Design a protein that fits this description.
This protein is an alpha+beta fold and 352 residues long. Helix content is 32%, strand content 22%. It has a single domain, classed as DD-peptidase/beta-lactamase superfamily (Beta-lactamase, 3-Layer(aba) Sandwich), CATH 3.40.710. The longest helix is centred in the first third of the chain and has 18 residues. Class C beta-lactamase which confers resistance to penicillins and cephalosporins. Has benzylpenicillin- and cephaloridine-hydrolyzing activity. Has weak cefuroxime, cefotaxime, cefoxitin and oxacillin-hydrolyzing activities.
Length: 352
């Protein structure tokens, strides 16, 4: 690692860890396309296990980028179309409010106010159908954006139906395997538990709890090496040999809607680069959206990013395609989003 990268990373993260009381953290900087790794602290405080390049962290909502790319791949394969009605892949959804709601609306949180969380009471397949049938939109489709797990979560579930594979099998075979993310999991196998960090919430060790559409919305666990590979794949999709996956990655970084200075892709969110650091910057935030008709194909001069959290973890990924630059920050404490973005910007701005 060039001393320059070493210095900006350490000078930025050391203080972050101190100020936020983060138990353990891993960071990857992709510079001129090559990855440089950094780790600090503990994966498990009680057992004194250090964070290493093999430690698994819960990605939380950064998992939505995988769902958006898997969806992009199904589109490229001709299995689904974002313009299709939700009812085409779920005929049992007969309630009238669903008329006009398309897979694009689900994927981009513009269905009309689907809730941030699926209630804990919802578990079985019949429970889920009931939940969506009973939901009453606050708004017409494609008029307001409300970030929601029950929205992109349903998109992920429907998107894999034509394939005949479960969401986990589809993700493994169409995304993880092709990209060689061999230590990325929806369900952590027993063989890999020795590497699964504990998350910390109010000092207590915790792992994410099972929930409906958890795989689709916030259930991926990964290492800093595999996430660095994920960032490189998204920085240069053309190097990817699998044709539909290469295309899927590109579809996920297309700009479908605009709210303020930000653009909504599939999972990924983007802003034009150069970005005002404070512009990159609440339990529920409903914002009107302007449709980008037709969507803008992935713009190289973009700050592409996604924040993620679970009760015990906090993650952040951001990259700038035009500069072959990127960063992944994984931590086992859910600390403020502004602090993650401030650190990422400080590091990437210094190397750009």
């Amino acid at each position: 690692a060039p001393q320059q990268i070493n210095d900006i990373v350490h000078r930025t993260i050391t203080p972050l860890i101190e100020q936020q009381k983060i138990p353990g953290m891993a960071v990857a900087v992709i510079y001129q396309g090559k990855p440089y790794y950094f780790t600090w602290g503990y994966a498990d405080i009680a057992k004194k296990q250090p964070v290493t390049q093999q430690t698994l962290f819960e990605l939380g909502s950064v998992s939505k980028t995988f769902t958006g790319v898997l969806g992009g791949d199904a589109i490229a394969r001709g299995e689904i179309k974002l313009s299709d009605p939700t009812t085409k892949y779920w005929p049992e959804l007969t309630a009238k409010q669903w008329n006009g709601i398309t897979l694009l609306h689900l994927a981009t949180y513009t269905a009309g106010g689907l809730p941030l969380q699926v209630p804990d009471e919802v578990k079985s397949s019949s429970d889920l159908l009931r939940f969506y049938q009973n939901w009453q939109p606050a708004w017409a489709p494609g008029t307001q954006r409300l970030y929601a797990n029950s929205s992109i979560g349903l998109f992920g579930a429907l998107a894999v139906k034509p394939s005949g594979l479960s969401f986990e099998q589809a993700m493994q075979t169409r995304v993880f395997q092709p990209l060689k993310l061999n230590h990325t999991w929806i369900n952590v196998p027993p063989a890999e538990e020795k590497n699964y960090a504990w998350g910390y919430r109010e000092g207590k060790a915790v792992h994410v709890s099972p929930g409906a559409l958890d795989a689709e919305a916030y259930g991926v666990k990964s290492t800093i090496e595999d996430m660095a590979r994920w960032v490189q794949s998204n920085l240069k999709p053309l190097d990817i040999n699998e044709k539909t996956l290469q295309q899927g990655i590109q579809l996920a970084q297309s700009r479908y809607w605009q709210t303020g200075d930000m653009y909504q892709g599939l999972g990924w969110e983007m802003l034009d680069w150069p970005v005002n650091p404070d512009s990159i910057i609440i339990a529920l935030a409903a914002r009107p959206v302007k449709a980008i008709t037709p969507p803008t194909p992935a713009v190289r001069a973009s700050w592409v990013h996604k924040t993620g959290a679970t009760g015990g973890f906090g993650s952040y990924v951001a990259f700038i395609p035009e500069k072959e630059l990127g960063i992944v920050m994984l931590a086992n404490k859910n600390y403020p989003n502004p602090a993650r973005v401030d650190a990422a910007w400080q590091i990437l701005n210094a190397l750009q």
